[PDB]
């Protein structure tokens, strides 16, 4: 069960220590890049990616919640991103072109669906993804209501992968915590994007927080 | 001669130490908040403001390079901003409304003009500003060509203040460094927004960097 | 067979009398709120809703043909709306958030599909709707050509409700008149939004108009 | 001193009586048409204009607070508008074209400036206007703070008219009431757009309301 | 096997001769009309259509890669277009209205899907199309990578036509050349839009070019 | 008196001959590149520039009537443009950046104002222009009403050049014909952009057309 900490939830006062801890414990760094337009909020950016790059060995995954993802691929590659997760709802008319550009920069391809987007949306290019993520909450902020209906999406995504003989990992984004770990794993999740409720909030010290989270995942 | 370090140019690995140093040496924290639309880039956000707030006593100045500044005033106030610098080119039809909202949150008012916007743009509300900033480079990125033509704008802004008996501070944003300190002061600048070329770049250690910059300002 | 008169088709000269008549004869007040952007036209608004509220006991249903439905929920609730009908094509990325906000204001949830949007568009939240409406004409104006192809959508919507054990009412919007009553009922319609051709136009006096309409529905 | 009642402030329950009263007492009908985009609100529309047309002899003045005024000229002419008031900030690149279209429909030309727009904005076509209006409040809603700074704009507009030998009427829009009548007349206003605070609010009965307003204008 | 030369790939120096040759050899003239917004590029326009009209008898097919197809139907009809090919992704909320407008102008209806749009997108109006085109490359430019995944779309489109008893022609747009002729025909293609790689590039002289292409189609 | 033929008005049937004639008789090729958004129309594009480049020695001047001029500079340079004429109303926040990019491509800088934009709009960078053009008609189409008011703009532009000791050429765009030649020269025009009414329309044969135009300019 892979872990991907949401950096928009970290403590910048302990930036260096938290990144180093995460780099030696987690599987991915989840970096949210918002537009203020595709979603009503602003969080991280290439600048943040560039800084995390200084002490990272694990892959930096940039979730592009922006209107024009085409504008950030080259810039994000230079900042040190390893994964570029695209929203199918922002790439109609350019999905293949962008996926090629992403790989031309030696980065991996991620696809992320918000609540109301069906998996078929990616049917013609789902086989080009290394990881597919399911928003279990409408995008934009931390601490929003979990959307149970998304469990079926996780399952459908798992069945699709098996039936088509694909190898993409299934990730979950949105209120991944003690109240949802079980259902999510049962549904088919391979990766957990953990934020404030699932990690950082358990202890002011990240070691203790991670230990607590790890213990809770046990069940 | 007041100083306002551009935080999008800081080193997050030494976040806590750099903020504390800046808080006891500078006059303002310059926090750039970009849209990806008003300017083609993404840098800081309310989240960032919130983190800097943890150890700040000096005022946090949020430069709103966004299409809809109305969407960030309440959120920025809650994150701990003290100054909200508005672009006149984004408030036609709502300048007075926003200025009132800014003060209802007990924050100071800043006005910032990019290169091609004349000072008259603010003629009907220039007297409500605590600080007026002049972009000496087209907004968006660090390390762009200085625009000499902007010197007249700084001067005009100083003459306007005197002639109208106003008290706003005149700030400069864009390539403030050894090559421009003199001309800028002569033109009428009161505050220097210092970034990579003017500060951070002089020494890996911020104390030493600040010493070098201060020395260069001497001339 | 429930009736919902389209108020953008009423006679303001007899505002008070028509609203009172409608309030004691119809099941819903259909209030169209257009953007000028989502659809190329402008009709009613919160102001209108507020006025109708003065003498209404039946529920006011606000059909949001706007780009940003999020901007009107609180304002419409305040004006007295009881139903907020959302276009699935304007809520991708915020359907669950908005549906929660609507209920937080004690209003009922409506979902409306224009001609080219399939029912699956609502598959993950169709069970949260009190009423689902089918546009039988491209949105925007009154008196446009009926779209027969929409009959299958009404049917599919009825089969879906039965198969999933749901209780939403099925509404029809667009050229509901003598020429379509039969087919619409046969297809599965529960509610008729009646405008100029189906109601108001039959007689300058609304009692007589309603009488004629009721008689025509008989067949 | 001409009067132009803001219809978005009227009582629809007494639609017919208020329009008839206004038609025989006022000089213009002020009809606000909003986009939800140019200004954050929705009020009246062509439908509304069409209804007022049924009993009007005085000119219907449609204030276009919309992003694309070009989309409403033919439709508004068709609904019965007599005046089309354009926002200079929405016609750059098409002012002359639109002014010609307005006159090709036999309608008069109005120009309206919001707070932060200087009179020079209209310098190349100011001589084509029958009436020029000054927003004394940021556009969008009723009951907002009066903007004293706008008095100079009214004056400048009067001086311009005299100096250039023009004949346009000067109108005021925004918090025209007892607290501002005097200053506005002194500044140069020819027409008062009266809303809730200046008219409708004085008495539930419009005759009495109008009587009180007229008396207050006396001073 | 019908041919439709992409005019954005022709040689304007030999305009008259190439159009005349094409008019007596091809089945359609493929005229690309781009927005700079729907796709990131600009190519042909009504002006171009008008010129080709001077010597054409074969139908001019205008592929509308624009944000607002509604703005070009009357103008294109006037310039002499015979076919208007619409993108389903630009007509939600107005497909039936536009299709009717196209036919009021006595023009034929075309529907074109870019890579990531499924055929169901047109399910409610697919029967109104004379020709349906499949983009085998993300729209915008010539010489992009062929998308094999689109072969299934061509097939599905053929099965749909048979199963529903429809008569639309199936067209292919994007890298139609020697490397793809076979697979495309096998998949179900009826018409080939030929550009630089498939036609013009084979010989500076268009007769010779057309010969080479025809020979390659043989296999 | 320099001449710049508007190619959107040429005859493509005689493409090669007209370009060659123009290349040996005119001073510039005026190539209009429209967005469909900045102005409501579509005309020429990089493709067109590329073709004219095949037989041109005189400079190709691309007038960018587009929302995002930044998207076309590299592409246009590649196609062979020599002049890039920018609209000040589309470069606020990037005028200096774009002007630098234009020169990095070894192209000359043009600035074009539509009717309602004052010359001051360019005050901070007017000295970087090789040619400044005045629209004497709202942009978008050929054959629109001449705007006399623009004569003052031409004059002001000439006075500005003299007073500031600049060397830019003054160009006129819009209904340059027999009815306006005199006034335009008197006002200060240095270059005439000639279209259908001023050139092409005088004779089906371009030699004769040019002959007639040249003679009319004599007066
Ligand atoms: Mg995320
Ligand atoms: Mg800044
Ligand atoms: Mg409706
Ligand atoms: Mg108004
Ligand atoms: Mg094409
Ligand atoms: Mg031009």
d(CA B59, CA B85): 12
Experimental method reported for this structure: X-ray
Which residues are CB-neighbours of C40 under 8 A, at least 6 positions away? C140, D71, E70
Long-range contacts (CB closer than 8 Å, 24 or more residues apart) made by D215-219: D216/D177, D216/D178, D216/D181, D217/D1, D217/D181, D217/D192, D219/D181, D219/D182
Q: How far apart are CA E85 and CA F56, in angstroms?
A: 35
The residue to which tokens 């809730």 are assigned: D196
Show residues of chain F in contact with B38, CB under 8 Å.
93
Longest dimension (CA), chain B: 47
Answer for the pair B99, B125: CB distance below 8 angstroms, yes or no. yes
CATH number for the domain spanning F85: value is 3.20.20.70
Q: Which residues are CB-neighbours of C131 under 8 A, at least 6 positions away?
A: C61, C83, C85, C108, C109, C110, C111, C168, C169, C170, C171, C191
Any B CB within 8 A of A15 CB: yes
CA proximity to D137, closest of D186, D178, D176: D176
Distance CA C121, CA C132 (A): 12
Half-sphere exposure of B117 (CA within 13 A, CB side): 25
Q: What is the spatial distance between Cα F59 and Cα F53, in angstroms, rounded to a whole number? A: 9
Q: Is C23 annotated among the ligand-binding residues?
A: no
User: What 3-state class would DSSP assign to A207?
Assistant: helix
CA atoms of B109 and B129, how far apart (whole Å):
5
**Alpha-carbon span E97 to F33, nearest angstrom:** 30
Annotated catalytic residue within B32, B35, B61, B190: B32
* Residue B6 in marked binding region: yes
Q: Output the CA angle B116-B118-B123, nearest 5 degrees.
A: 150
> What are E9's two structure tokens?
């790939």
Residue-by-residue DSSP string for C60-124: EEEEEESS-GGGTHHHHHHHT-SEEEE-GGG-TTTHHHHHHHHHHTT-EEEEEE-TT--GGGGTT
How far from the centroid of its chain's Cα atoms is residue A92's Cα?
21
| B143 in reach of chain F (CB within 8 A) | no
B93 appears as a binding residue in the annotation: no
Give the residue carrying structure tokens 């999020």. C70
Give how far D169 is from chain B: nearest CA, Å: 22
In the numeric block, the tokens 């005046």 are attached to D83
Instruction: Give the end-to-end CA distance of chain E in Å, rounded to a whole number.
Output: 12
* C195 annotated ligand-binding residue: yes
Q: A with C: how many residue pairs have Cβ under 8 Å apart?
A: 41
* Lookup: tokens for A106: 């030696």
- On chain D, the residues whose CB falls within 8 A of the CB of B121 are 116
Overall domain count for chain D = 1
CA–centroid distance for A136 within its chain: 12
Residue among C197, C159, C209, C171 at smallest CA distance from C9 = C197
Token pair belonging to C31: 């209030």
Name the residue with tokens 């500005």: F160
- Ion ligand 2 neighbours, Cβ < 5 Å: B 32, 63, 173
Residue F37 marked ligand-binding = no
R_g (Cα) of chain B, nearest Å: 16
E67 is in an annotated binding site: no
The SS3 call for residue B84 is strand
CA distance A48 to A45: 5
Question: Residue F6 annotated as binding?
Answer: yes
* C-alpha E193 to ligand 5 mean position (Å): 8
Contact C13, C50 (CB under 8 A): no
Backbone angles phi, psi at D175, to 5 degrees: 45, 50
d(CA E4, CA C80) in angstroms, rounded, equals 58
Residue C98 corresponds to which tokens in the numbers above? 């908005």
Q: Is B80 left (phi over 0), alpha (psi -120 to 50) or beta?
A: left
E contacts of C115 (beta carbons < 8 Å): 93, 95-96, 124-125
Sign of the alpha-carbon torsion through D173, D174, D179, D184? negative
CB contact under 8 A, A138 and C88: no
Query: How many Å apart are CA F185 and CA A207, to the nearest integer?
Result: 80
Number of H helices, E strands in chain A: 7, 8
Which of F88, F92, F123 minimises the CB distance to B89? Answer: F92
Q: Is F38 on the interface with D (CB under 8 A)?
A: yes
Cα distance between residue B131 and residue B129, in whole Å = 5
Contacts of residue D70, Cβ cutoff 8 Å, sequence gap at least 6: D94, D98, D101, F40
The neighbouring-strand residues paired with B83 are B61, B108
Residue B82 designated active-site: no
The residues near A133 (Cβ < 8 Å, ≥ 6 apart) are A63, A85, A110, A111, A112, A113, A170, A171, A172, A173, A191, A193
The DSSP line for D158-179 is: HHHHHHHT---EEEEES--STT
The overall longest dimension of chain C from CA atoms, in Å, is 47
User: Which is it for the CA torsion F101, F106, F108, F112, positive or negative?
Assistant: negative
Do the annotations mark residue B50 as ligand-binding?
Answer: no
Question: Rounded to an integer, what distance in angstroms lies between the CA atom of residue C59 and that of residue C79?
Answer: 12
Resolution for this experimental structure (Å): 2.5
Local structure of B110: helix, strand or coil: strand
DSSP assignment of C24-60: TT-S-EEEEEE-SSSSS---B-HHHHHHHHTT--SPE
CA distance F187 to D165: 23
Q: Separation of D213 CA from ligand 4 center, angstroms?
A: 19
SS3 C14: helix
**Within chain E, how many helices (H) and strands (E) appear?**
7, 8
Distance CA A169, CA A158 (A): 9
Answer yes or no: do D115 and B123 touch at CB < 8 A: no
Domain containing residue F21: 1-219
Which H or E run contains D62? strand D60-65
Query: Which residues on chain B are in Cβ contact (under 8 Å) with F70?
Result: 40
Task: Characterize the bridge pairing of strands A108-113 and B131-135.
Answer: unpaired
The CB-side HSE value for E87 (13 A sphere, CA atoms) comes to: 25
Sign for the CA dihedral angle at B131, B132, B138, B143 comes to negative
Residues from chain C contacting residue D71 (CB–CB below 8 Å) = 36, 40
Which stretches within chain B are classed as H helix?
Answer: 15-23, 46-53, 73-79, 95-104, 150-164, 181-187, 206-218
- Ligand 6 centroid to F133 CA: how many Å? 9
* Residue E13: strand, helix, or coil: helix
Query: For residue A24, what are the contacts with CB-CB under 8 A and spacing of at least 6?
Result: none
Q: B121: burial class by Cβ within 10 Å (0-12, 13-18, 19+)?
A: buried
How many angstroms away from the CA of C78 is the closest CA of chain D?
A: 14
Residue B35 C-alpha to ligand 2 middle, in angstroms? 13
* Cα(C194)–Cα(C3) distance, integer angstroms: 7
Residue D51 neighbours by CB under 8 Å, 6+ apart: C11, C12, C13, D15
Task: Concatenate the DSSP letters of all residues of A34-92 into one string.
Answer: E-SSSSS---B-HHHHHHHHTT--SPEEEEEESS-GGGTHHHHHHHT-SEEEE-GGG-T
> Of A23, A32, A35, A130, which is the active-site residue?
A32
Q: Which ligand is nearest to the CA of A28?
A: 1
Nearest CA in chain A to C98: A138
In what order do the strands lie in the sheet containing D108-113?
D2-5, D191-194, D169-173, D131-135, D108-113, D83-86, D60-65, D29-34
Interface C:D, Cβ pairs < 8 A: 82
Q: How far is D38 from chain C (nearest CA, A)?
A: 11
| E87 neighbourhood in chain C, CB within 8 Å | none
- Rounded Cα distance between D86 and C79, Å, is 29
Nearest to A16 among B13, B33, B46 (CB): B13
Q: Does C44 touch chain D (CB under 8 A)?
A: yes
Distance from CA of B205 to the nearest CA of D (A): 45
Question: What is the number of alpha carbons within 13 Å of residue C24 lying toward its C-beta?
Answer: 8
Q: D119, D111, D45, D55: which is closest to D78 by C-alpha?
A: D45
Q: How many CB pairs under 8 A join E and F?
A: 82
Residues 6+ apart with CB under 8 A from D218: none
Question: Catalytic residue at C173?
Answer: yes
What is the token pair recorded at B150?
Answer: 């902007």
CB-based burial label for D163 (10 Å; 0-12, 13-18, 19+): exposed
> D3: closest CA among D169, D114, D205?
D169
Chain-chain contact of F150 with D124 (C-beta, under 8 angstroms): yes
**Cβ contacts of E45 on chain F, cutoff 8 Å:** 34, 41-45
Q: Please report where in the chains the tokens 């005759």 appear, as a residue.
A: D207
DSSP A202: G
CA nearest neighbour of B59 among B101, B5, B9: B5
Residue labelled with tokens 């335009």: F184
Burial class (CB in 10 A: 0-12, 13-18, 19+), D71: middle
Touching subunits of A (3+ CB pairs, under 8 Å) are B, C, E
Q: Give the closest ligand to the alpha carbon of residue E171.
A: 5
Give the whole-angstrom CA distance, residue E100 versus residue E107: 10
CA distances from B53 to B23, B77, C113 (A): 10, 11, 46
Cross-strand partners of B131 = B110, B169
Cα D181 off chain centre by:
16
Q: What is the DSSP string of E158-179?
A: HHHHHHHT---EEEEES--STT
Question: Which 3 state secondary structure label does DSSP give C172?
Answer: strand
Q: Which residues pair with F170 in a beta bridge?
A: F132
Q: How far is F73 from chain E (nearest CA, A)?
A: 12
Write out the H or E segment, with its range, that includes residue C21.
helix C15-23
Token duo for residue D116: 């932060």
If you measure CA to CA, which chain C residue comes closest to E98? C138
Give burial (CB, 10 Å; 0-12/13-18/19+) of E34. Answer: buried
Contact B192, B181 (CB under 8 A): yes
The DSSP H or E segment spanning D211 is helix D206-218
Three-state secondary structure call for residue B57: coil
The Cα–Cα gap between E94 and E117 comes to 17
Q: For residue D83, what are the β-bridge partners?
A: D61, D108
Assigned token pair, A177: 């915590």
Structure tokens at D153: 């704009």
Among D118, A15, A41, residue whose Cα is nearest residue B120: D118
DSSP state of A130: S
How many other CB atoms are found less than 10 A from the CB of residue A27? 17
CA nearest B113 in F: which residue? F93
| CA F137/CA F39 separation, integer angstroms | 12
Contact F183, F147 (CB under 8 A): no
* Minimal C-alpha gap between B54 and chain F (Å): 33
Nearest residue to D136 via CA among D185, D187, D169, D172:
D172
Residues facing B44 on adjacent strands: B33
From chain C, pick out residues whose CB is under 8 angstroms from the CB of A39: 93
Cβ atoms of residues C23 and C60 within 8 Å = no
Mind giving me the DSSP string for C122-171?
GTTTGGG-SEEEEESS-TT-SSPPP-TTHHHHHHHHHHHHHHHT--PEEE
Tokens of D4: 């132009």
Q: Which helix (H) or strand (E) holds F215?
A: helix F206-218
């Amino acid at each position: 069960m892979k872990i991907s900490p949401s950096l928009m939830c970290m403590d910048l006062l302990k930036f260096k220590e938290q990144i180093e801890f995460i780099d030696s414990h987690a599987d991915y760094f989840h970096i949210d890049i918002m537009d203020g337009h595709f979603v009503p909020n602003l969080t991280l950016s290439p600048f943040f990616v560039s800084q995390v790059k200084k002490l990272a060995t694990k892959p930096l995954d940039c979730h592009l919640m922006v209107t024009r993802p085409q504008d950030y691929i080259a810039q994000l590659a230079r900042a040190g991103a390893d994964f570029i997760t695209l929203h199918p709802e922002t790439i109609n008319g350019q999905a293949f072109r962008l996926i090629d550009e992403i790989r031309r920069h030696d980065m991996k391809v991620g696809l992320i669906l918000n609540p109301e987007t069906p998996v078929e949306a990616m049917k013609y290019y789902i086989h080009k993804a290394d990881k597919i993520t399911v928003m279990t909450v409408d995008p934009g902020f931390a601490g929003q209501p979990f959307i149970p209906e998304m469990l079926d999406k996780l399952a459908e995504l798992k069945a699709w992968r098996e039936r088509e003989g694909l190898e993409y990992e299934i990730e979950v984004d949105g209120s991944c915590n003690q109240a949802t770990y079980e259902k999510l794993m049962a549904a088919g999740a391979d990766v957990f994007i953990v934020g404030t409720s699932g990690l950082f909030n358990h202890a002011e010290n990240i070691d203790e927080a991670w230990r607590i989270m790890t213990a809770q995942i046990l069940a």
